[PDB]
Amino acid sequence: SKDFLYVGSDAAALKYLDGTLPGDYGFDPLGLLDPTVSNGQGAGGFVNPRWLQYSEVIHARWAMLGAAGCIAPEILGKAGVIPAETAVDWFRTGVIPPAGVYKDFWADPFTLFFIEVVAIQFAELKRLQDYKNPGSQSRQYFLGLEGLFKGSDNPAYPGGPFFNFANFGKTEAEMKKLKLNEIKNGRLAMLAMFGYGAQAVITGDGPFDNLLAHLADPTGANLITNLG
Amino acid sequence: DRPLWSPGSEPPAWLDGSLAGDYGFDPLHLSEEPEMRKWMVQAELVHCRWAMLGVAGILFTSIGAKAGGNFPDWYDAGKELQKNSDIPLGSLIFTELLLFGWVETKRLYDLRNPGSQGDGSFLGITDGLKGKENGYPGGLFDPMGMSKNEASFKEAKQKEVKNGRLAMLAFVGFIAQHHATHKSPIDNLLDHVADPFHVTFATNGVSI
Amino acid sequence: KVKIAVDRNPVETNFEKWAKPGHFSRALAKGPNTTTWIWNLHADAHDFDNHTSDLEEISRKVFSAHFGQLGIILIWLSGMYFHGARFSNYEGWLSDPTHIKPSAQVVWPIVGQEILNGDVGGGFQGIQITSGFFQLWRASGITSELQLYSTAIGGLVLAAACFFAGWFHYHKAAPKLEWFQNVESMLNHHLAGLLGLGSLAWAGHQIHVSLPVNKLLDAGVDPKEIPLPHEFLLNQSIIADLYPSFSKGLAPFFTLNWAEYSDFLTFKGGLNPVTGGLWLSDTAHHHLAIAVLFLVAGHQYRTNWGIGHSIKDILESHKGPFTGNGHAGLYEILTTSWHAQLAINLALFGSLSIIVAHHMYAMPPYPYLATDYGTQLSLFTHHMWIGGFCVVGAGAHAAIFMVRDYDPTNNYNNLLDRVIRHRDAIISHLNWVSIFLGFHSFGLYIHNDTMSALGRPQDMFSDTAIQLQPVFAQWIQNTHFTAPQLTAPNALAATSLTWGGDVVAVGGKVAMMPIALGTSDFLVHHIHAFTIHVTVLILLKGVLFARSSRLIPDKANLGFRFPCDGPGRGGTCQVSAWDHVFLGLFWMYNSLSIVIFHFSWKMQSDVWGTVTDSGVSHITGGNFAQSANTINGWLRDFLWAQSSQVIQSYGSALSAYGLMFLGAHFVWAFSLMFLFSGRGYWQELIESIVWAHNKLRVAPSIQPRALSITQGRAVGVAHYLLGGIATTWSFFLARIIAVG
Amino acid sequence: GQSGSVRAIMVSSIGACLFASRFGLAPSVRKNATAAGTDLEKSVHAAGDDPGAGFTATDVLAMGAAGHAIGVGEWLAQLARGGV
Amino acid sequence: MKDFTTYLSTAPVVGLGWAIFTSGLLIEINRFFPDPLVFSF
């Protein structure tokens, strides 16, 4: 209505969205946040506002962890804190056996994968029921840790005593400001992860190594000259 | 009001929690009808009892074989125990089938006609040979009077179901680790504690 | 305006409706009083228009049925890949494609049946297949059976996903009519996304994985020492060794120096001399061009961004002086009726299948396919039959639309109204053309028969006596042959060896030899034109007279599938549009049988055979030009001279073809019982049998009636087509497998 | 690397196509031609910061794609003739 | 569950229960006992 929105806005997008959501910028030309989609009742499909905003915040947080971790052992590897043996790239540490695989681990990569499957299956499955039944993981006995899974009105922001042990949303303005900060940084991290994956295929090196090569030669080490 | 198999889900209508070992896990809607439920509960109880006896026997002979006795492993046990035996096969098969026909036929007719075999027909036994519950007989199969107390009988029934399910889940695991390693279950257990990081289900060639 | 209108949870998911078998129609819900209820339940199971008049409900039902069909096709495709992975000899055939015969089916030894497990060579025994799956698996690099196993598992996963998608879109998230009516969006995504991205992805696969077949497999390298397909994708040196342009690395593509990719994007007009098929680099360059063409084609219509076109505007802007209005309500016709779209789609689909049949034998695209006469003849014949069945179906659905979804309010003076206005002139002219072609195309055969019988061989239509030469086709053949010298300078040679002069042969057997045309080719071509005109006459008459004829003026209200209109006016049996389709099916069978007969005999007598040092010897004695001019020549030198393999097939490996031959004959002979008799006779005979059962009190609770008038015609035409097609199938397979 | 032969009119094709898509005289989202002789005025959908000319992002994409098609085509074809 | 078991009593009970039973019985008889042209009397 008043704020200078992003390039590529739409009349109908401004008709169904304007300054209400945290990442509200009027950028939805494809029309996926339209309330006319899935006009019935019940479970339904996936393209709907309730699930799409939930998917955007979950993607933002996972991409922030990924972008911070895909360059951390390489940045510390170029520094003198981490040992050079464990300072490998993010695509040769077991994610893809063909690119490469780290050797000295405390277990086999498949064993670590099974442990990860059980652990993250518990986490993501408990995360799904709360979305299906709001605030239902605080009723069944789960090792006495039911006091930390109380949930909230929004599935994207559960809060509680664990996820929000350090209280920061004392005021709605500061809570909304911090929410906008999380949304913007998560979108930047998603683009950084996309850049990390695309740069890893053309250059075949780590993400921080591409920046060091681009800084030493701006024209000799750029995208246009990389596909040569 | 009771812990369910999926925290946050809702149990079915025909599973209130009054059954022995009820948790609300029934996605394929089996045992929805009263007669089908009456048959399925007895099928689970008989499977739990046979699984507990079989797993206990396998672990006993396997532990005895690891200790030093002349016991064969759980797999291929019938092959090397029949070559040096005077009891002929076929005759042993039909002897087992003949005795089991009598026992299982009396147990089946006890299910279709509840409290019917205890009528002085089989050698004059009236007090016993009549079940107390669905798949819980009494009179003769209860030497110790532990069923004459509902407060402890309910808890003991819960213990029986929860132990039988773990035993049959363990029996399925006996076949898998045997077919994956060609060793005894007690040999696989002792080998896992000797190296919990290197040896596991992912470092045995098979199942990858 | 183009959005995603979905209606979540419209139909529950239970088995309550599975209990009552007749529930889609309001007439079958009463239950089965007479045995005709069972046949009505099966014949009305897919007529969604009879279920309701809700276009949104009808559209949702057809959208879920499409997913069910895709799941069925994916399961069948996965089954073929799994059979080739486990019960075949693909690895043995890969090292000797010119001596081991394909096989991908093993039979279990129950009652006899060991004889069917024929010795196909390579230390394996099974049913010899003629599907060409081995040649297809050769064309896109596939060395071991692990890749076929992985393809079968991946296809089964995709089949389960398609079935889940069908259930989801009909019970959990059903779309709306406003979503289904976006024809501009559907055309944009089908042209740009589906076809264009499919060609681009297949071009990428041929550019990277089809590398062993084009450079290592044909060079004599053992399939085990060939590097895996991912090594060529990751390691650039291993691909640069084969093709030097790969050393450039996407630089000539983006710097517009495409001339550097001239080694793996060749334009060679011909066949590979080591395999017999087209060049893989040529097929790759072909797919790359097609992808660009379709990607630029998918940006024609306007959807949500202003730029583009409007199909309604393009149709309404085409008005001429000979057609009155023209294309007035064609958009309303094609966007509100499914039968109209189904008729157009089925017509183009069947014609496309026929095009595929011609181009596959003409320009063989798979390695070691031209030297496999069994798979060659099998693939041509199969694609021809599928195409003919689809065109008859198009003629059926056009009449269905004209009977049900034709409103005479939105069509006042358009092309449809003008066409229905001069239907008498159209049918009379097609009738005359049909009769003229029949006389001039069959009287020549009967004339040659009489001239040969009377002892006057110099008075017959043959090459030696009075001839008729197809000069137009001879000139087109010459034009295509000398065309790469003047009108195609970048092409290395002619697009096919059908009109050339250089015979290619792999493994001693001929691959693609030049084809000559004489008087017999002129006679058989006119035979084909005549049968095509009769089939189009029956179908077009049915469509144009399905609404209301001058004999029966109220034929529209009578329905589409009705027996007759009583014994009045001398008799009005089979006057319905459905009956015309039944008559048409018969003529399509009569046309395609002559088409496949002409193909088999012409190939066996003029192209296929074996080459030696002292010339090339064909399969037959090269008697196509001296024995096709007479009808007795066909019955004597084709059906009687051939089929001797099918006849003497007992006790051999192909013993099932003699059984299939005799069995097919019985089914065809069984069709005549349903096709000549009526219904009153069978109803009275069934009455006598009912008395016999009532005497013993075994009277069925559901009173046993005879089949319907249209059911008897349907049963008869189904049995007739099954018997004739299976007869030709057993004969073709046994002959070409035992000879070629 | 080198921008002096193919770069010279690739730049020319894209630029002329931008002139068409902006200074009017070309099918766009701000101006639609019904009979290819005249161009009707259609209200735009999105907002462009372009200075009262009502230029849109889709106009940039459409005209740039067409200009690229015409430009790429000209460059490959021109080499075949003998020029450049 | 009642609707599924009543659905299983229309066409499968006669075309896949009896057909599979009879076909399997005749096939297993001809498999364990080879080809029978007389009563072996």
Ligand code: CLA
């Ligand atoms: C997140 C920000 C970001 C930053 C700071 C950098 C920084 C750098 N990149 Mg990188 N890149 C990024 C994102 C980023 N990139 C993304 C998202 C992609 C995927 C398309 C790439 C793909 C890429 C490649 C393949 C290469 C680089 C290279 C480089 C280095 C040289 C600069 C150059 O060559 O031009 C940069 C080239 C680009 C493609 C950057 C443009 C990305 C912009 C910000 C967005 C593009 C739009 C995107 C395609 C679609 C998203 C929007 C959509 C809604 C329309 C440099 C240090 C080169 C290198 O490694 O140097 C040795 C190299 O060849 N980048």
Ligand code: CLA
């Ligand atoms: C389309 C089938 C067909 C055709 C084209 C021919 C053609 C021919 N037959 Mg024949 N024949 C046929 C079927 C056919 N036959 C059949 C089925 C039988 C078995 C019953 C025979 C048995 C037979 C015998 C026994 C003999 C022939 C003979 C002949 C030849 C001379 C016969 C004759 O009288 O000249 C033609 C006479 C005509 C009046 C032709 C009229 C031409 C019409 C008018 C077309 C020209 C005008 C046209 C409408 C253009 C329109 C103009 C516009 C302004 C309107 C001739 C080339 C004789 C022969 O010796 O062969 C060399 C002979 O002895 N035939």
Ligand code: CLA
């Ligand atoms: C080869 C073609 C053919 C065949 C097989 C038959 C067969 C039969 N006709 Mg018929 N008929 C024919 C042509 C044929 N007709 C023609 C062209 C006409 C002139 C229009 C007639 C006119 C006619 C009349 C007027 C009558 C018959 C009658 C009969 C039945 C006689 C009873 C009998 O003989 O025991 C059985 C003989 C058989 C050959 C049985 C065939 C079935 C076998 C066992 C195969 C079973 C299928 C197998 C199990 C696989 C099934 C699965 C499959 C669906 C996928 C019989 C089924 C009379 C009748 O109704 O009898 C009461 C009768 O009234 N026919």
Ligand code: CLA
């Ligand atoms: C570029 C996007 C795209 C693609 C690739 C397709 C592809 C397809 N469409 Mg579709 N369509 C699209 C956009 C697209 N469509 C849009 C935007 C609309 C709305 C106007 C429609 C409306 C539409 C209708 C009404 C129908 C189709 C149908 C079909 C199928 C035709 C089957 C066939 O002929 O052989 C080709 C077969 C294959 C290539 C096998 C591939 C199978 C995979 C699983 C397909 C996955 C593609 C899918 C579109 C991905 C997005 C969905 C995602 C949420 C999973 C085909 C797979 C027909 C259909 O439903 O068939 C089921 C049909 O009735 N489409």
Ligand code: CLA
């Ligand atoms: C349409 C299909 C297709 C595909 C899939 C490929 C693919 C490829 N081609 Mg290619 N090619 C094609 C068609 C295709 N081609 C055609 C039609 C031609 C002309 C005939 C060529 C001619 C050609 C040449 C001359 C060459 C290639 C080459 C290559 C390889 C590298 C190219 C590259 O680095 O680009 C860029 C790659 C990217 C930008 C990466 C994509 C971004 C990734 C996937 C994003 C994922 C990140 C995600 C957000 C996070 C990761 C997840 C993680 C956390 C788990 C590559 C495997 C080169 C080669 O031979 O390789 C050895 C090369 O020399 N091609």
Ligand code: CLA
């Ligand atoms: C061998 C059997 C046979 C024959 C000969 C015919 C013949 C004919 N059918 Mg037919 N049909 C048949 C079986 C047959 N059918 C069967 C089994 C079915 C069921 C599916 C049908 C269903 C069917 C339909 C639905 C239609 C036809 C039609 C036609 C006519 C099309 C005329 C034409 O274009 O070609 C040319 C005609 C001929 C070649 C007839 C042979 C004449 C020869 C050359 C003799 C020459 C004359 C001779 C010299 C003079 C004799 C002298 C004597 C008097 C002393 C044609 C006369 C169509 C029609 O009515 O025409 C528009 C029509 O729509 N048929």
Ligand SMILES: CCCCCCCCCCCCCCCC(=O)OC[C@H](COP(=O)(O)OC[C@@H](O)CO)OC(=O)CCCCCCCCCCCCCCC
């Ligand atoms: C090779 C194919 C068969 C060859 C012989 C075909 C002739 C038999 C049917 C003719 C019926 C005549 C009634 C016309 C009905 C009619 O007059 O329609 C009207 C049409 C002009 O209509 P309008 O201009 O008013 O139409 C404009 C709007 O309706 C646009 O939708 O005139 C023509 O069709 C000219 C073509 C005459 C016939 C050309 C044959 C078309 C076949 C394919 C092209 C062949 C070219 C030569 C290749 C060898």
Ligand SMILES: CCCCCCCCCCCCO[C@H]1O[C@H](CO)[C@@H](O[C@H]2O[C@H](CO)[C@@H](O)[C@H](O)[C@H]2O)[C@H](O)[C@H]1O
């Ligand atoms: C859904 C997407 C794909 C998922 C993959 C699906 C399953 C893939 C594995 C199933 C194949 C079964 O594999 C089984 O048969 C193969 C048939 O040669 C054999 O595989 C063996 O021969 C192969 C032929 O080159 C070799 O590459 C293997 O190293 C060797 O193990 C083995 O006996 C066994 O590995």
Ligand SMILES: CC1=C(C/C=C(\C)CCC[C@H](C)CCC[C@H](C)CCCC(C)C)C(=O)c2ccccc2C1=O
């Ligand atoms: C024979 C005939 C009938 C009578 C058709 C009947 C009685 C249909 C017969 C259907 C049978 C009963 C289906 C099942 C077939 C066999 C029983 C399958 C054999 C399976 C065994 C293994 C048990 C018609 O009603 C009719 C109507 C119009 C034109 C022609 C005809 C016509 O020719």
